[PDB]
């Protein structure tokens with residue numbers, strides 16, 4: 001039962017900080033993405049995110065909507081998500097809300113790679129707050145949603161695959177579902 005993905009496809013962007021790259025969600029004039037993007041490969045195992053944040057400037061972020069670069073004019077960190085303020089509002093922004101779902105609820109996921117939509121499928125949140133998704137490498141920042149009439153409810157931002165092959169992430173305010181932390185361990 002996956003929801004049609006057209007309204008979300010127009011919101012996906014590629015976010016690059018140095019050589020680390022993942023997917024971002026562009027709504028109005030804000031891009032949301034996992035804060036993990038500010039890690040170099042050596043920081044990924046045990047990042048000090050407050051320190052890494054101090055060291056970055058707006059011009060260290062490259063945001064691409066397709067072949068169009070968007071100018072970053074502000075950035076801030078909210079729990080495990082980074083919010084990049086860009087100088088252009090997304091003209092395909094749908095009506096949307098952010099919601100936090102519970103175990104047992106289902107949602108659709110738009111898997112993206114390097115900012116480009118790749119597939120859509122339905123998932124359920126398990127009681128241990130993991131999901132059995134279909135995510136490959138490069139899918140970090142892909143989002144889960146439901147459609148509520150005309151309104152897109154965003155409920156899941158993908159961060160990591162765990163050793164057993166299931167997946168974990170945050171709501172759109174950056175709070176993990178479950179007892180996980182955004183580090184490569």
Ligand SMILES: Cn1cnc(Cn2c(=O)nc(Nc3cc4cn(C)nc4cc3Cl)n(Cc3cc(F)c(F)cc3F)c2=O)n1
Nearest residue numbers: 019020021036135136137138139140159160161182183184
């Ligand atoms: C197999 N699989 C299924 N889902 C995933 C999701 N995922 C991902 O796509 N990427 C990750 N690490 C990165 C490596 C990078 C190399 N470059 C050049 N840029 C990169 C950017 C990322 Cl995000 N990871 C690992 C991971 C991502 C996190 F956000 C986190 F907090 C901890 C982690 F261990 C990953 O799971 N891969």
